[PDB]
Amino acid sequence: AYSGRKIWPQKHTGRARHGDIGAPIFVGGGVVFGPKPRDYSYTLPKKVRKKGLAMAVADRAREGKLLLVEAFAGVNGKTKEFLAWAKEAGLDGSESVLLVTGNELVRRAARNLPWVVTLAPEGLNVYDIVRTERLVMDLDAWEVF
Amino acid sequence: MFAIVKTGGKQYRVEPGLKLRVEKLDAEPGATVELPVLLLGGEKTVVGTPVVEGASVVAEVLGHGRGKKILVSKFKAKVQYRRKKGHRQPYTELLIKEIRG
């Protein structure tokens, strides 16, 4: 931002061999490039997308997960409809659970999921499942062959 | 009447039932009874018989009573910017008790 163009002499000056308004002191002037837009964007492929979710859930099965794959909860829309599928399925407040169903019906159904996930397409939210457990999938096909 | 001994380059003289410092050694806390070797004795009334040693056969006597205290120190030098700070020396302490010979 084009600075005012230098200042006072040097040898003498107002006592201080220095005179470039680069502003090496003003709280908002000539500092250092810590940040910089590029927040370094690194990533990888399915080489691990698979292998990872495997050992985890597989171990989470050494604790018991569940898998249904495909079913009916009721009017695949209302909160407490699926509630009739919470106390009649078995699950309840503590272990925390996650589940994938690609039907937009379940989408505008699961709305706010206090205790669980609610998914649609193909993400990878092991994150919360790591600190949790219970699960269900959408066909052995969706997990990917 | 006094009495003296060394707990490893530390010479002390206790009346009947005193104590405060002397670093430390093992042997479980207050309830155990032990004793090492003496020099010649102590003064007052009528002592005065040291000679060659005497530290054989006989010996002194003292009880036990561990309280184990870590005692601070505070270390620091200072030369040309070399002021290596932050360093205490906990070390041991004993608050036991004594008796006779």
């Binding site: 810590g34 940040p35 | 505070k74 620091k76």
Partner: protein, 117 residues
């Protein structure tokens, strides 16, 4: 990303205050001056934790000449007397028997030069 000082300087300059704040006036009112005087109250406090030993050492010894100057003889001399013959110690300090009842060490002084006949 936005990390800049704040209060941390005070922590690493406050000990400076307390651990000192009792010296002069200036060496106890400027973080640096105290800083430096801690270095002195340091090389000197450590130099006087180094001192006390090689100070009290002598204070006893000559007094031991004062036990023998009035009881007959002198220091160095009476020393050997014992050392060669039998037991060896009395610790240059324990001879504080000097103040607490005398005739005591009198008996033993004569014990020292005994090894000469």
């Amino acid at each position: 990303p936005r990390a800049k000082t704040g209060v941390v300087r005070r922590r690493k300059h406050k000990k400076i205050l307390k651990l000192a704040k009792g010296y002069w006036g200036l060496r106890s009112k400027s973080f640096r001056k105290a800083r430096e005087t801690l270095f002195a109250a340091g090389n000197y406090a450590y130099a006087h934790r180094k001192r006390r030993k090689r100070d009290f050492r002598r204070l006893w010894i000559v007094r031991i000449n004062a036990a023998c100057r009035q009881h007959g003889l002198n220091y160095s001399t009476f020393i050997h007397g014992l050392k060669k013959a039998g037991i060896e110690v009395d610790r240059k300090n324990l001879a504080d028997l000097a103040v607490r009842e005398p005739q005591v060490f009198a008996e033993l002084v004569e014990r020292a030069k005994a090894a000469q006949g």
